Amino acid sequence: VKYRGTAHGTNEYPFLIDTDGFSVLPVSALGLLHQVHEERIASGVPDLDAMM
Amino acid sequence: LEAELQAEEIALKALVESESAHERQRLADADTLARSRGNERFA
Numbered sequence A: 001v002k003y004r005g006t007a008h009g010t011n012e013y014p015f016l017i018d019t020d021g022f023s024v025l026p027v028s029a030l031g032l033l034h035q036v037h038e039e040r041i042a043s044g045v046p047d048l049d050a051m052m
Numbered sequence B: 001l002e003a004e005l006q007a008e009e010i011a012l013k014a015l016v017e018s019e020s021a022h023e024r025q026r027l028a029d030a031d032t033l034a035r036s037r038g039n040e041r042f043a
Helices: B002-035
Strands: A015-017 A022-024
Touching: none
Parallel strands: none
Antiparallel strands: A015 A022
16 A cells, blocks of 8 residues: 555456465466577378468 | 261261360369459468
């Protein structure tokens, strides 16, 4: 609700008390910084793979 | 009568030519259609 002196998150963040303790996995920490690969993955349907 | 039979021969010729052309054009059209629907372009 308040934290004087700096910026912080201001939304409500669902969390979990589980076997190891408090756990918060905020959705605001998800970015769009992935890495891309050039291989391909076979489907197990050789006909479908031929469509690409 | 000879002139008549020569005319008939020419008619036979023209008919065979037309049939051959029709066979050819159907094969070309079938190949075109099977191209525009095939997955070759991705091999």
